Symmetry: none
């Protein structure tokens, strides 16, 4: 399992709301239903129901890189890399509504 | 078994406004038929309301400290079972904040 921590940012980039959810170390939930994506579409799904303060699918999750800068990710291929940075079982990300 | 839950009221300067505690049951949920999903969360959030009338009845969010210490606004039973996993004693501390 892997707990993913999300950080809500308003106008002053200030933590608006904080929530976490238990994730599976597996690559994807389904094998047949999955039509390409998996982790991204899954995470972005929770963040929506967890952060109703903003649109359901009108937001972009930005993750810190080796440099620290923010990189709005939206693809499974990007997730597998994001986890490569964190050595622990905690995946932190910056949530921002479009 | 029993478990006392301590709540901390926060105003504008995040200063302790009011302090109150209530005896809780170690059981998973109070009812089995009436319960329509939730249990501990809906139960705790119920007391905090009657205990902290200074704010809205259901217009508040309880934040609990994590392994890191940061505040995590919880609102689901699944989140409660985890919060208790942190505290080893029979005292559950939480930060109450009115929306």
């Amino acid at each position: 399992s892997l707990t993913v921590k999300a950080y809500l940012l308003g106008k002053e980039e200030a933590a608006r709301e904080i929530r976490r959810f238990s994730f599976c170390f597996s690559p994807e939930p389904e094998a047949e239903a999955a039509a390409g994506p998996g982790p991204s579409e899954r995470l972005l799904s929770r963040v929506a129901v967890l952060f109703p303060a903003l649109r359901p699918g009108g937001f972009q999750a930005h993750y810190r890189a080796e440099r620290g800068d923010l990189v709005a990710f939206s693809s499974d291929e990007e997730l597998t890399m994001a986890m490569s940075y964190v050595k622990d079982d905690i995946f932190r990300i910056y949530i921002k509504e479009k």
